[PDB]
């Protein structure tokens, strides 16, 4: 039941999503090994992801979390990169999209930094890079990320350099504790706590 609606670059909604993509790029401690070397993206397309059933699945769970947390869903817009972006937008997030080996346990991981999620487009650690050139830093091939609506509820704070949420919590927040420029990363343990709102198609751009 999924349909993808293209946003025009003139649409304020395109512009605000692009600006969150671009403004949350940072340098990574791997010097670009996983995600490539770039300071910015070439945004090719931004599509709104419309699926009534998946939306209602999300809002039902959101109300549950909200009622468990003094009427506060603690909803964020966060990035998600994955080899499975195309199954996600059709079938929703579930246990099969979880990073089993992630540092906060087997859950589904999201980033404030678009460049962090970009490191997972071709798999963990960038995998073997793009399908066509086997290049983790490919400047040619078209990549895709999701910009997702995520319900955090009461989030467990982890200071730091599917399973269940910690008892009494609905998510985990990975707070950066060494790299002062890194933004937070988050983990949910129920696929119903995220909705893939935007599909963004882009290239990373070679610095000049
Ligand atoms: O567990 C595996 C093994 N191969 C694979 O594609 N997965 C699924 C997977 C999907 C997304 C991510 C992912 N992990 C992150 C960790 C931190 C921040 C962002 C992300 C992010 O955007 N995506 C990790 C693993
Ligand atoms: Zn390529």
Curated annotation (Swiss-Prot):
Ubiquitinated at 'Lys-48' and 'Lys-63' by RNF146 when auto-poly-ADP-ribosylated; this leads to degradation. Deubiquitinated by USP25; leading to stabilization. ADP-ribosylated (-auto). Poly-ADP-ribosylated protein is recognized by RNF146, followed by ubiquitination. Zn(2+) binds at residues 130, 133, 138, 141. Highly expressed in placenta, skeletal muscle, liver, brain, kidney, heart, thymus, spinal cord, lung, peripheral blood leukocytes, pancreas, lymph nodes, spleen, prostate, testis, ovary, small intestine, colon, mammary gland, breast and breast carcinoma, and in common-type meningioma. Highly expressed in fetal liver, heart and brain. It is found in: Cytoplasm; Golgi apparatus membrane; Nucleus; Chromosome, Telomere. Residues 8-208 form the PARP catalytic domain. It comes from the Eukaryota. Belongs to the ARTD/PARP family. Oligomerizes and associates with TNKS. Interacts with the cytoplasmic domain of LNPEP/Otase in SLC2A4/GLUT4-vesicles. Binds to the N-terminus of Grb14 and TRF1 with its ankyrin repeat region. Interacts with HIF1AN. Interacts with RNF146; this interaction leads to ubiquitination and proteasomal degradation. Interacts with NUMA1. Poly-ADP-ribosyltransferase involved in various processes such as Wnt signaling pathway, telomere length and vesicle trafficking. Acts as an activator of the Wnt signaling pathway by mediating poly-ADP-ribosylation of AXIN1 and AXIN2, 2 key components of the beta-catenin destruction complex: poly-ADP-ribosylated target proteins are recognized by RNF146, which mediates their ubiquitination and subsequent degradation. Also mediates poly-ADP-ribosylation of BLZF1 and CASC3, followed by recruitment of RNF146 and subsequent ubiquitination. This is Poly [ADP-ribose] polymerase tankyrase-2. The chain holds residues 952 to 1161 of 1166 of the full protein.
